[PDB]
Every structure is written in structure tokens, then in C-alpha cells.
A paper describes a structure:
Pannexins are single-membrane large-pore channels that release ions and ATP upon activation. Three isoforms of pannexins 1, 2, and 3, perform diverse cellular roles and differ in their pore lining residues. The PANX isoforms, PANX1, PANX2, and PANX3 harbor substitutions in the residues that control channel gating and can have architectural differences that form the basis for altered properties among the three isoforms.
We elucidated the structure of PANX1R217H (TM3) substitution to characterize the effects of this germline mutant and to understand the basis of its defective channel properties. The arginine residue at the 217 position (TM3) is highly conserved among vertebrate PANX1 orthologues and is buried amongst TM helices and does not display solvent access unlike the substitutions studied earlier. Despite the lower resolution of the structure, it resembles PANX1WT globally, with subtle changes in extracellular domain (ECD), extracellular helix 1 (EH1), and the intracellular domain (ICD). The G44 in TM1 that likely acts as a hinge point facilitates the TM1 bending and displacement as a consequence of R217H substitution. In comparison to the PANX1WT, the modeled side chain W74 has a χ2 torsion angle shift of nearly 80° towards the pore leading to a constriction of the pore diameter in the mutant PANX1. A comparison of normalized conductance to voltage for PANX1R217H and PANX1WT reveals altered voltage sensitivity (V50) of the mutant channel from around 40 mV for the PANX1WT to over 100 mV indicating reduced voltage sensitivity as a consequence of R217H mutation.
Author numbering:
A (entry chain F), B (entry chain E), C (entry chain D), D (entry chain C), E (entry chain B), F (entry chain A), ...: 2 to 13, 26 to 155, 194 to 300, 305 to 312, 326 to 356
The structure:
């Protein structure tokens, strides 16, 4: 049904530095294609078969079903049928779900790749940094970390990975958007094509008509889903490029009492789970 | 069935300050469309296909099924069929479930957005505040928090987010209500339309009649669900605007013994889980 | 089947003061409609379609199916069919499951509303009261709570909510019972109605007969379920009004060694989980 | 199938005093109707529809299906069909599953009622009694409970509830057994009845025959299930009346070293979970 | 399918004295009927309906289906059909699955009865015995249990229950084996029977032939399952009678350093979970 | 589908001495038949019914279906049909899945029998041995076990059970392999057989032809699965016989600082979970 | 559907040294065939049967279905049909899913074999090594491990197993890629073949035509899935050979303060879960 789709797609010492306020972007870019595919072939809208041939009155049920199946499997053979637009729109109308799944997988892969290998190292590094900071504060209440900060600043082995990971997703979004823009530009009449069953010995028989009629079914639904995906992706595109400006958008709090941008972001997002942080916030917020 | 819908839609150191007595509003505004969609296409009411063409007696099963499928997929093509009202009512009758799902998602998004990013900061802040208050009371039994309170009062970075989040939902409710008001105003006869299969080479044949008959099925159910949603939403609308008046509707309890409104609400809703609160309540309730 | 319904509907420091020996009433008033709806449309009784038109012999399968679907969707249009009783009984026979679900939701809502907001405050209050009582008894073994009791007695902010919550349910039961009384009073012949397919250009054709026959199917099952619900609700009605008399139906146990009614009930129902209660019961039961 | 029924019906500081060696009786009296209903409508035996009308050769598929549905829904109308036995056997053959479910619910209710309200009080009482006994024994190793025992003996507020609860079940068993005895006494030919479709304008037409034939299907299965339930219940009946004699069927163990019957039973069934009980058993078993 | 059957039937301070190396016998005697029933009506072998009537050419689909259903429900009526063997083989061919389920339940009941009531008492007794033995050994490292052993030897209230429980199962196995021996002895031609639809007013009509043909389908599968069950049960029978000789097949280990048979078995099977047992085993194994 | 088969068959103080690097052999010998059976009757390949009779043109749907069912159930009766090869190949083609399940159960039984009864004793023995060894090493850091080792060496009550258990599996593999070798040797034309419906009174009628045609369907799939199982089993056979040579393939590690083979294997496989083992390994690995 | 495939295939003191940054390769090489097989036979694309025969007009439904089934099961018999390409392409088109599952199993086996037997030994070895290193560092703060390192360097019993395990997978990938390259090279017309039903006595009849037409359906989908698998595997191939160069791609960190490659990799990947590692990293990162 539909209740089994929306309730599972969107209704369903560990730092949150992995997602970087980008988990929502991946979730909405990977679950939307799946949700649209599930609702397109649901038991409510996809009532009829995707293809329905118009066989003559002389034909029985079996011959008409054979014509239907043949014309369904003769879409790829250019020598069988003929259309003014060509076989590319028919190919797209036949293989839209598979390429939608391909785009879904292309979106899903890079975040999992980032989480699998590049997440544990920086996360353990940030636990180490926060533990050292807490120890320093406890000692002061009752300095070598700055050296680590400047050495990490001199490092260049992590920001490149982040920008590559968050540029691959933008490239995939651009490709999907331009593809859907091309797809929505179809004349919407290409589903009308003439199917001819005259292959092999069937040439001798004259009872079968030379050419048939065949219109694809459930084509407007594909167009509506495509335009919905197009508008969602064009709305979402600026978010990723806004994220890409990491160094252009905390650590300097205690005062007396380059890859550095990523570490700064991870440090400033982690203010919770430690009691001393909020106490210092209030103490040098009242003073300043 | 129906037992699998109602039992899962409504029958199915952590502060509750996230929901602010508004979790019920989101739940009833997001589960009702899903419940109605599930019951509309249940195995009890949606017995018949949404479309049933009346083919002549000469046609066999296959030709009639082809006519049915074509007219189902010819609703979008304005050049095929013709109706006095136009193709807009037919579009709505075809795509009602998808736009209902769209409204469901539009309701579901803002609460999750609020819970994902704006909830942890204020929640950790309130644990800090209550811990400081408990420490102050324990010290008194055996003052810097007021400075934090007035600094938070001078702040303006949280109330704006709350009012925007709870105004977006009101805007979406208004849009859904006006749309359903338009939809219920349909003449209920627009489902009667004339379908003609005369596209392409089928022009040569004269056996097929020029024009057919075609009435949509399961249309009154859509109207009843639409009016039910309309009445529910018009009843629910005042609740959100009542909530929006946060500063116009506790902290001053112990006595001797602007974003401030949100913090005041979160403080007054959190009186449980601490033993000293009820003891103070009784002590300066007997005295005052 | 049926095994999946009965086994899940009825076979499937925390005080129990929320339910107040009324959880059973809500459970039997909310699960019975669901159980009846599930068994009505089970794979054992709902074998046949709800509607079966009698088309002439000339018509083929497709024309008869079209007549069936049209007459199913022409029940709401008063200008199509005609019956002596009117279109109200037909409306009821078509929309019985939906209104049953509506009554189920109307029963389910008030208990959840009471549990969501009015339960935690009084429950935390009763833990506070019992903890204070236990501390007082421990001190005596090795008095300010009475002041709290009399102040709560002077309060009037909780009994009104309880009586309103347990009067709304009675009102809904009365409405459901009177509706089912009206429904069972149907002549049981209203399912016989004459359906005419003469809308639009089909006027020109003379092959179609002017008027058809159409009897609804699975109508007696609805009547039996309605009368079962009626008898269950009329039997259940006195229970709620008996509950409503809260102040007219413990705390005075230890002796030397108005909203007050609700607190008294919650106190007397909570005698378990504390060891001193039973010891005092036996000590001043032997003496008195 | 069948594997999903038997494996889930019978193969699937807390005292066990709630069940009193009667949990098996409730389980076998509540799961047997469900198991029989599930196996009756399984995908192995219930292959055919419950009703099969014999329409003439002139009728097509649709007219025969309409006759089938009408005669299925015309069983309740006494003016349509006619049988020598009457409409009561037909009513029973139509509504056997629903009344079986009704008997199942009538068996299920009283044990849950007993467990919900009358179980916690006596169970907490027995933990109190056993704790006091253990404390007394520990003190003796290194007497006020008898007063509690005699006061409970003078009480009369619990045995009445138990006997009423275990007499209601016997009454329901008697009613079910006598009903099944009546049902098995059917002539087994009442399923043969004459169905006439001559209601309304169909009177004018002469093509339809005046009277039809109609035999119910899957009727012997109902008779076999009914007789199986009858024999099971008549075998089970003496168990409940044997249980009812509670005072006529331990506490006097330690020696030097009326509702009383229920407490005595609960005490003697609880000898486990305490180490001193078995030690005393052996010590004054060797001596006596 | 089949993967859902085998993986769930056989692939799917607490002493193990309950099973007494007999859990396997109960498991294989209760899961085999269920497995065979599930595989008999699987979606691979039970492709065809159990009954297929041969109606004449004049009959349409509906009349043939009515004949099929009638002859399916006319097997019990001896006056309708006639066969040389009689109606007993037809009864068996119709009700084989139900009696197989009955045998499955008859096997399942006695082990659960033994585990429910007779298991906890002896199990708690054996924990008491092993704890006393461990305490005695600890005291010796740094005698009243023998009195308990001889008193239990003088007792006769447990061995009788065990032998009755393990003789009831043998009786049920004997009954099932002799029944399957009778069933496999069928001539395998009894499924050929002549069905006549001439009941009631249908006597007047002459179009229907006087007598029909009707052969049951999926009958050889039942015979193969019956013979498989027969061979399994005849192979399994000696195991139970071998078990019954409990006193004829440990405690005398430490040395210086009648119901008694059951306690001896339970003691000797429980050598694990205690460290001193294996140490004593090696110490007086080296010496003796 | 297929995703539900492969993901659940192969993708889905406790010593591992039970399996002895033979758990994989049992898993691949018990899950392969189940996987092959599941994929054979999947919703992708088993599209068509196993049997398809060629009835004449005069026959309608019902007579052809009756012929199909009869010939499906007339395979066992040798007097009905006739084939040059005989009824044995037809029996095998009909009952291949059941005998495959039988082989699966025959493989599954012996490992479970070994794990149920013979595993706990030796496993507890090995915990005792390793605990004694650890205690001896701790005492040495700050000898009676050798006596236990030689007494176990003199014992002969466990190796026989192991060799019998791992020879029964080899015997079953040999039987399955030779059976599949016979089955693959079928002429593959035995599925062509002549079916005659002339039993009983149908002899009088002359419309039915004397002999029919009937070819089994989904027979090549069975042959391919059989040859796959054959090659897998012939490849797997040497593994079991390699395992059987237990005494011909550790304990002598510490040095200064017959059933014995099984205990030696269990000891040498258990080097983990104890810290002293690896330390000794390195200490007398550097020295030797 | 499709939502049940992608969400479960890719969306769904313990060291991670088992996977060695190769878990992703196994996951994508084992889940892709399963995902493609599931989507190929989904309820959206696999609408039509794989085979559709074109029977003449004289044939009824049953004869056409028999022809369909026969030609489906006559693909293997070379003497029945005839095609210019041969029976090999038809064999491949019939058995593509089974060989895809075979390749999936061939990929799945080696990683599980490596994890089952070769993982625990080296993993326990690495816990021992890291514990010894931590103890050495703690002693230094308040050397025999190097001897273990050089002895392991002299060992040659583990690198061979790793290279064999990661070369078997490469061999299987090469075989799958070359097979798919052959399969995609099919002329795509081989699905056109002539089927003749003239086996056995059917030779006498002349009504059946000598030769038929038969085109396979859902063949282009197989080609697209094959080419997708081909491109994925050819892209993935260099990853495995890059991994194979283990010795050519840490331990030397503390300084004053051959199978060796695998141990070095496992050591350098395990820097987390120990506090001293990061502290040493910063200390001799600032100095060097």
C-alpha cells in the first residue's frame, strides 16, 4: 500500500561529527527516488499493464497476449517497430525505474564511503582532543594541545577528502537534474508506435495484419515523478554548494581562563556531554 | 485490511521540552492523510478499478481492456478526450493520492527539522540550568544563574526559529484547507467524459466507434475523504495560532528560600524528576 | 484469517493510577469495532463483491463489469437511481466501515489525551506523597503532609478535567448507540434499487435496457454486526456513569500510629510496592 | 497453511498463584475454537466457495455470479426462499464462525478479568506473608502472623469472587455444549434450498426461471468441527466442577520448630524460591 | 515454499532434568506430522484442486463448477453417490489432514502436561539436594541428606506419574501406527466414485445426465506421507519402551571422601555447573 | 523471490570444540538442497504447471482441466498409462522434491544428535582441564592432571561415537551421490507418456478419445539441479574422509616451564581466551 | 516491490583487522547480483511470462497453453526445435538467473572461509601484541616483544593463505567478466526459434501445424543487467590487484620513548581504543 512506504522512508561517547548537518541532505536525496518508485508501482495507481496492444477481432485471447508480449520485447529491436522520434524515448520509457535506482545508489555510495573509512580516525582524534582539553581545565581549576592544533593546521590530508566527497555528490545531482530535464522535454506522444509481427516464417501467413497499434500505459505518472524529482533537486542544489564553503563558515572561548577548518567545525559542534563547557560559556559570557 | 492501519497509525535524563504539547498536533496532521489513503485503497472499499470503459458488443475482452488502458492514459492528453469542465478536474481525480502524500510530507518535515538541529542545544542548556539550580538549592540547605537568565533574555537567536517553524506549519495547513475546499466544490459529474481512440493509423479502420463512454470509479470516496480532511483541518487551525502566542502564555517559586519566553516554558514544564521541586512547592504553598 | 485478529485484539516505580480500573472499558470500546470490521471483511465471509448487477444476456463480460462499476459509483448520484426509501440507506450501506472507524477513533482519542497531559503531574504528585509518608513513618518508628492534603482539597483544577474526560466518552457512546439503533431499523429491502445507465451520449443507443436490477451483497452481516455493537454498548453504558460518581465511592489507616476524591482514590489504590503498608494494615487490623 | 496455526496456538519474585492449575483449562477452552476456525478456512480444505448456484445454460458467467451472490444474501429474507426445516438452520450455517468467535471471547474474558483486578492484591498479600514467615524463622534460628491468618479466615470478600469467576466459565461451557448438541442434530439436508430471483421489475421478464437450485458447500466440515468441540467440552466439564470444590481440597509444617481455603492453597503451592522450606520439610520429615 | 518449513521445524541455574533425553522423541513425533502436512499443501505439489468432476460438453463453466462443489460436499451423503468399497475410504481421503493434526496434538499434550506441573517440584528438589551436597563437601574439605534419600526411596508419588506419562505416548503411537497401517491398505481405486446430482426439483429436468464421473486428486501424495509416517513411527516405537525401563538403567562416587530411580537419574545427569564434581571424579578415578 | 533465499541460507566461556572445523561441511550439505528446492519453485522459473495435457478441440476448459488433473494423479496407477521406460522415472519426476527434503533431513540429523548429547560432557571436561592447567601455571609462577590425561587415554567411550557420527554422514553422502547419478542417467524422454481416461462408466461414451498426450513440464530444471548436487557432493566427499583420520592429525608446549586424539584436538584448538597461553608460546618459541 | 530490495541490500575488544578495507569489495561483489536478480523479477518489470507461443486461431486456450509449456520445456531437446545459432544461446537465456546465483555464491564463499578459520588466530595474536605493548609503555612511564616480531617475520604460514584467498576472488571475477562479455555478444535474435510439437502419436493428427513461432520475453532486461554487471566488474578488477600488493604498502613510532607485512598492516590499522597511542603520536609528532 502507501502506509508501508512513508512510515518506513521518512518516519523511521559517540560524537555526531560524521554527518556535519548533512545527514538530512543524503537522506532526502536517497529516499525520495525509492519513495517515488514505490508509489509509482503501488497497488493503487499501477492498476494496468505498462503495455496494451490493439489486436483485431479475429484474434483470440492467446494471440493478443502473444502480440502484447512480443511488442513489449520488440521495443529494443529497431528493425521491428518505427517511430518518428526514434527508439531513445521508448528505451527511456522502458528503463526509467532502473536508472532511477542507479541514481539512488550513486547518491547512497559516497556518504557510506566517507563514514566507513574517514570517520573513525577524525572521531577518535576529537575524543582525544576533548579529553586533553578537559584534563587541562581540571588541572587549571585545581599547554601542549596547541602544538597539536598547529600541526593539524599544517596538515592537508583530510580537507581534500571532504571536498572531493561533497563535490562528487554535487556532480551526481547535476547529472540527474540535466537527465530529468531532458526526459521531461519528451513530446509525450512517443508512446504511440507501430508494432509489426512479421519475423520469420510468419511472413507466409496473411491472416495477421501487417502493422498494429500499441500505446504505452502509465507514462504520465513517470513524467510527473520526473518533474517532481527535478524541482526537488534544483531546490536542493544550493545546499551542497553552501556546505562546500567549509573554511568560510567556538575554539576561542577559554582565553586566559589547511585542514584546520574541519577540526574547528567538529570542535564547535561538540559542546555537549561535558559539564565544563557550559560553565565556561556562562562565566566568560557574563564578563564578555 | 483495516486492523493493520488503525493499530499502527494511532495505537502505536531526557526532557520532553522538544514537543511543547505540540507532538499531538503533528501526529494528527501527519497520520490522518496516511490513514485515509490506506483505508481508501483497502481490500474492502477499493474493490473495483478506478476506470471502466463501455466498449461495444463486437469488441472482445482484449480490445475492451486496450480501450480501458488507453482512456486511463489519455486523461492527460487534452486533444484525445473532451469535457465541459476541462482537464483540471480529471487531473485532480487521477492524482489525488500523490498530492495527499505530498501534503503529508510537507507536514512531517518541519517538526523533524526542529527536532534534528534546534532541540539538542536548548535541551542541554536546560539540563545545565536545572543542575545549577539543584546545586544552588543544596548549597542553601547546607547566585550566578540569574546572570545567565538575563543574558538569554537579551538573546534573540531562538524565538525566531520557533515562530518560523510553527508558522510554516500554519501556512501549509492553510494551503491544504483551501485546496480541499476547491476540490470539494467540483460538480461531481466531471468524471463523465468522452474518450476517442482515433490516434494514428487507426483512423483508416471504421469498425471502432468514433467516441466511447468512460466514467471514473471510486470518486465519491475521494470526495468524502477530502471533506473529512477539510473539517479536521479547519477544526485544528486555531490550535496552532493559539500555540504561536508563546510570550503571552514557575520560575518565580523559591523567592527568598526576547527569547526568555521559550526558556520559561521549558523550565515550568520541567518540574518532575527532581525531588526538591515538589518539596519547595508544598513549603511555599502552605506559606502562600 | 481469524487467528490473526482475536490473538492481537484481546489476547495481546510506575503507578497504575492512570487507568483507574477504566482501562478495560476503553479497550473493549476501541477494540470491538476494529475486531468486527476485520472479521466482516475476512477471507471467510466476504467472499463475494458488495455489489452484483444483473446485466442482460446480450452483454458480454466487459459491459456487465462496466454496469457493475457504474452502479457502484452511481449510488451517490440521486438523479441516476431511484428507491422508495431514499438515498440515505444506500449511503449508510456504502459507508458503514468508515463511520465505524470514525467511532473507533472517537473512543480512542480521549483516553490518550488524558494519559498524555494529565497523567504525569498527578502521578509524580503521588510518588511525592507516598515518599513523604514513608519518611514520616520511618521517623516515627525510629507533620506537614496534612497541609498539602487540605490545600489539594481546596484545589479545583483536576476533578473537572476527569469528569469532562469521562463524560465525553459517555456522550460518544450515546451517539453511537442511537446511530446503531437507527441503522438496525432499516427495512432491509433498501438494498434493492433500480440502476439506469443513460448518462450522456449513451442516450442515442437503444441496445442498452432503460433500467437494470442491482442488489447489494453482504448487508445482513452489517446488520448483525450493528446489533451486536448496539447490545454491547447498551450493556456497557451503566459502567461509565457508575465511574462518574467518583466522590461518592484507605487514607485513614495509621491514626495515632473538591478534588480530594481523585487523590483519595489514587492513594487507596496504591497500597503495594511498600512494605510498611501491609504491616500497618495487620497491626491496626488486629487492634481494630 | 497449517504450520502457522498449531505452532502458535499450542506450541507458543512472581508467584504462580494466579493460575491455580487452571491456566491449562482456559488455554484449551480459548485456543481450540480459534484453531478449529483457522483450520476450517485454511488454504487446504476451504478450496470452494460456501455457496454454488446451478444456473441454466442460457445464463452467462455474470448472470450466474449475480444469482450466486443474491442467493447468498437472500438467506436471511424468508420471503425469497423456502425450506421445510426453516430459516434457522440456514442462519446457523451462515453464521457459525461468528458465534464460535463469540464463545471464544466469552471464555477469554473471565480469566483476564480475574487476573486484572483480583490477582495483585492477594499476590502482594502472599509475598507479605512469606516474608513475615521467613523473618520469623530467621529470628527463631538465631508470633503475630497467626492473628493475620485468623482475621483473613473471618473475611469473606475473596472466596465469593473466585467461585463466581469459576462458575461463570462453567455456565458458558454448558451453554456452548448444549448449543453444539442442537447444531449437530441438524438433518444435514437443510443446505438444500430453493432460491427464487423474482424481486422487483424482474417479474416482467420470463427468461429467468421461477425457481433455482442452491446447495451450501463446506457444511460437513462445520458438523465435524462442532462434534469435536462438543466431545472436548463434555470431557472438560468435570474439571471445572472439580476445581470449584476449593475448601474440600502445607501450612501445618513447622509445628514447634470462609476465605481461608484460597490462602491455604496459595501458601501450599508456594514452597519454592525459599531455601528454608525444603530444609524444614526434610527436618520434620525425618522426625515424622 | 519449502524453505519456510524445514528451517522452522527442525532447524529452529536451570537443570535439564525435565527432558531426560526424551525431548528429541517428542520433537520428532510432533514436528513430523506438521512438516508433512505443510509440504503436502505447499505451492509446489498441491497445484491442482483435490476434486475434478467431468461435466459434459453442453455444460458451461458455472454448471461444471457447481457439479464440482456439490460432489465435493456430497461425499458425506451416502444416498447421493455409490462405491463398492463404501464411504469410509472417501471419508478418510477427505479428512486426512484433520486427523493428522489431531495425532499431532495428542503427541504434543503429554510432554507439556509433564513439564507444567511435575517438573518444578522435582527440579527445585534437585537444586536443594545439590546445594546440600556442595555444602557437605565444603564442610568436609575445611550427614543428613542420606535420610532424605531413603525417605524419597520410600515414596511412591512420582515414578507412577512418569510411567503413566511415558505410557500414554506409547499408546498414542500404537494407535497412530495401526491407523496408518489400515489407511495404506486402501485399494487406491476408492477415489473413483459416481456422483449424481438429482436432489430436489432437479429431478424434473432431463438435460443433466443421471450419473457423472469424479476422481479425487492428490491421493498418492497422502499415501506416500502415510507410509513415511508409518515407517518412522515403527522405527521410533522401541525407543519409548527402552525409556520406560527407568529403574533398570553416579551417586556412589564420593564414598569415604520405589521412586529412587528417577532421582538417581536426575542426579547422575547433573554433574556439570559444579566444580567439585569433576575434581572428585578425577581424584577417586586415579585411586580407583 | 531469490533475495529471500540466498540472504537467509548462507548470508545468515563457550568453547568451539563442538564443530571441530566441520560446521561448514554440515552447513553446505544441509542448506544446498533447501536452496536448490527454493530456487526451483521460485516465482521466476516455476512459471508453468508441472503437467500440461493436450486435449482435443471439442473439449472445453473444464474437461481439459479434468484430464490434466486425472493424468497428474494417474501417474502412480500403472494400468492407466504406459511408457517404454516404465513408471519408475515418472515416480522420480513426481517425487523429486520430497526425496530431496528427505536427504536434507538425513544430513541435518547426525550433527544435531552429536551436539545434543555428546557435546556438553566433553566441553565441561575441557573447561575443567583448562582451569586445572591455569591453576597449575599460576602456582608454578608464584602435578595430577597428567593422571587424568592417561586415564582418558585408556578410555574408549568417545572416539567410537565420533567416528560413527562422521561415518554415518559419509554413508548418506554416498547414497545421495549414487541416487543422483542414477537420476541424471534418465533418457530425458520419459516425460513423454500416453494418458488414457477410460476408467469406469466413461467406457460407454465415445466422444472422449482413447488416448491422449501428456508431457511433464519443468523437468530439465530438475536435471540441472540434480547434476549440480552431484558435482557438489562428489567434490565434498574427500573432506569427510580426511576428517575421519583424527588420530593421524599443542599439548607439549610448557615442557619444564584410544580416545586421547579427540581430547588433544580439543586442547590444541583452544588456545584463546587465556592470557598465559600466548605468553608461554612466545617464551618457549624464542628459546626453541 | 523495489523498496524492499535497496533498503536491505545496501542500506542495511573487537578489532576490525578481519576486513582489511576489503569488506566493501565483497559486499558490492555479492549484493549486486542479488539486487539485479531481485529487480529483474520484480512486480514492475517482469509483468509478462518469459515465453509466449503464437498458436493458430483454431486452438483454444488449453491447447495454446499446452504449446507454450511444451516449447518452454522443449528448449533443451535439440531434436524438437531448430535455430541457426544453436541451443547454447537458448540455454543461456533459460538459465541466466541460476548462473548469476552461482557467481554470487562463488564470491560469497572465500571471505566467509577466511573469516571462519584464519581470523580468530591473528586477531587474538594482535590483542596479545597490543596488550604487551601497553604493558611495556606503562612500565617505561613508571623488551621481549621484538623477538616475537622477528619470529613472526621468519614465519611463512599466513601470507600465503591471504594471497590465495585474495587471488581466488580475482580469478572468479575474471571468469564472470569473460562470461558476461560472451553473453552480451549474442546476436539478440536467438530468442526467435521454431517450435514443433510432433512427438509421439501426435504424428497421426493433421490439425496441428507442423511448425510454430515462439519468441522469448524479457530478454533485453537480461542483456542490460549483464552489461551493467560487466562494467561494474571491469571497474572493480583493479581494486583487488591493488590490494594483492600487501608487502608493498606505524610500528616505528615510539623509537627511544615473509609474513611481517600482514602483521604490520593489522598493527597500523589498530591505533584506536588505546589512549597512549594518540599521546605518543602528538609527543613525537611535535618533536619530529
Amino acid at each position: 500500500a502507501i502506509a508501508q512506504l512513508a512510515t518506513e522512508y521518512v518516519f523511521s561517547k559517540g560524537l555526531r561529527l560524521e554527518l556535519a548537518v548533512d545527514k538530512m541532505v543524503t537522506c532526502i536525496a536517497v529516499g525520495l527516488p525509492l519513495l517515488l518508485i514505490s508509489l509509482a508501482f503501488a497497488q493503487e495507481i499501477s492498476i494496468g499493464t505498462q503495455i496494451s496492444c490493439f489486436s483485431p477481432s479475429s484474434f483470440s485471447w492467446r494471440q493478443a497476449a502473444f502480440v502484447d508480449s512480443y511488442c513489449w520485447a520488440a521495443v529494443q529491436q529497431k528493425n521491428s517497430l518505427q517511430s518518428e522520434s526514434g527508439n531513445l524515448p521508448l528505451w527511456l520509457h522502458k528503463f526509467f525505474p532502473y536508472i532511477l535506482l542507479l541514481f539512488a545508489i550513486l547518491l547512497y555510495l559516497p556518504p557510506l564511503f566517507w563514514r566507513f573509512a574517514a570517520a573513525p580516525h577524525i572521531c577518535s582524534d576529537l575524543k582525544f582532543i576533548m579529553e586533553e582539553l578537559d584534563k587541562v581545565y581540571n588541572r587549571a581549576i585545581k599547554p601542549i594541545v596547541e602544538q597539536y592544533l598547529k600541526t593539524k593546521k599544517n596538515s592537508n590530508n583530510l580537507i581534500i577528502k571532504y571536498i572531493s566527497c561533497h563535490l562528487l555528490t554535487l556532480i551526481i545531482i547535476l547529472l540527474a537534474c540535466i537527465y530529468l530535464g531532458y526526459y521531461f522535454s519528451l513530446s509525450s506522444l512517443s508512446d504511440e508506435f507501430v508494432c509489426s509481427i512479421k519475423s520469420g516464417i510468419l511472413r507466409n501467413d496473411s491472416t495477421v495484419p501487417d502493422q498494429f497499434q500499441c500505446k504505452l500505459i502509465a507514462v504520465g505518472i513517470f513524467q510527473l515523478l520526473s518533474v517532481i524529482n527535478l524541482v526537488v533537486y534544483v531546490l536542493l542544489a544550493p545546499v551542497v554548494v553552501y556546505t562546500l564553503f567549509v573554511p568560510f563558515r567556538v575554539l576561542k572561548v577559554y582565553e586566559i581562563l589547511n585542514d584546520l577548518s574541519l577540526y574547528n567545525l567538529f570542535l564547535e559542534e561538540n559542546i555537549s556531554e561535558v559539564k565544563s563547557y557550559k560553565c565556561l560559556k556562562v562565566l566568560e559570557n557574563i564578563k564578555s
